[PDB]
Amino acid sequence: KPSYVKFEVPKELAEKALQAVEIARDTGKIRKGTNETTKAVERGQAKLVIIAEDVDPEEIVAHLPPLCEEKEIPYIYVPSKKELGAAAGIEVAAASVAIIEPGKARDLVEEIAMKVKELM
Amino acid sequence: RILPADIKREVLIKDENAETNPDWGFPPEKRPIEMHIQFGVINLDKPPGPTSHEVVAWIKKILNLEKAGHGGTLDPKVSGVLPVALEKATRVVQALLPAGKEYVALMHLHGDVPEDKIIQVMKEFEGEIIQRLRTRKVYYIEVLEIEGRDVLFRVGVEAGTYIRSLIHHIGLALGVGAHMSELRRTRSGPFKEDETLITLHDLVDYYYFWKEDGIEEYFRKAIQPMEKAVEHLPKVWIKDSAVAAVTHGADLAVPGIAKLHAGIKRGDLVAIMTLKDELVALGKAMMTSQEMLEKTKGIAVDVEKVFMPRDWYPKLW
């Protein structure tokens, strides 16, 4: 699996990922697409970054994992860019998503930042 | 899958005793990185988007080059093999502009046609075609895959053939019509899709790895010796004692030749090589391979373009 994919993520952990994104969309505030996602990290607005594992070419998202770390922003990988896209409220796909303002997902997000923390 | 560049050549030996003095000249992998650039050619994988001309202006600004020139101009949406000759090697594109090309093309039919009729109708375009009015060869076409109205195929052609227009004529001959929806150049002369095929991201990153991190290895593999741009041409190899004379604008006389390719005819564009296989000059033959071999006096090659600097070899005259 892709070289930008910097660690193994469990199925239910990657499921919670979609969940937090699902919720945050309508109760809170997200950004969809690698360009908005990257803006949010640079601007220090993103609470969590979600990256799809099937991004081809890799260069599309490969700057993401190292950018987060510079800004100490937590990020997780999900299996599919189609599934991650549907969660974000668009029909088309999404290489990546930023959860700007959580809402009903406050605990879930806070939970995830903890699990991933251990995988680094 | 055969282009005229692919023909195998036979080396005829003229002077069995000729040897090269390892103290003179710089064969490709004895070239310091800076000298390698000065006489380098990039096998660039052009992205879809920018023009060929813009891409090269990027390369010049980011690599701090004074000069660089591409071969066959690929259109903005077309990706693939774009040779970029650098600095003192710039003028070798004139060896590529005329070489055969190959493309993988995606054709979208405007109406339904049976798979067999497509394949059968497309095979009729091998050989000459017209366009502009001018004529042009299709060396081969192969249909990789068909998916309803989408036909993916490879085609080998002569320089200056428009694939877009070829696809349009294929559309007319099927009745239903067609346009080209995707194009990628997979080959141009001696440049092909091998490990030398390098993207812009890689090109610029290797550069920085060299300039800022002190690692020379990647950038050096990113650049090819200008001799590469000349692999498809017939060659004559000359003795050390003729090389500085040639670089000084002398015509190459029969007594200067050590080895040559078979099958050279008068008028042919020839590469003139040292016995180390450095490129000396491009010239035009004034003799056939058999004449150059049998004779002991006379002008064998008219030296037109000289690439090697005048000081790599001593003035042995």
Place this chain on the structure above:
Amino acid sequence: FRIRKCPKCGRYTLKEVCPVCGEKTKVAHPPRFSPEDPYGEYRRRWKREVLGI
């Protein structure tokens, strides 16, 4: 973009699995590049790690 290729075989195909070899295929075209290269610094941070410099 639709044109794809085998990383193993070099076959061009529209499919996701090579029909000669069976490997997953990849998009034939190179990523888009821009002379600004806003994330170059971070792409190089990733690429060194991959390469081992």
Place this chain on the structure above:
RNA sequence: GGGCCACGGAAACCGCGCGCGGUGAUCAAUGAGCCGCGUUCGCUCCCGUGGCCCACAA
């Protein structure tokens, strides 16, 4: 005289395309639409200026 090498044989505006910044879309988020800023390589002849050589390979 001849060969070879270098320089030269236009400039400012507009537009498409593309790229970047901003906004971010009822199947283009691997970026719609819009706004602003950027943005287009050389080669071959031939002619002019200047430099190096006149070397059948010893």
Place this chain on the structure above:
RNA sequence: GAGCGGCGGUUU
């Protein structure tokens, strides 16, 4: 100045 592998239009 005339061509090869056009970015397109208007002003001296």
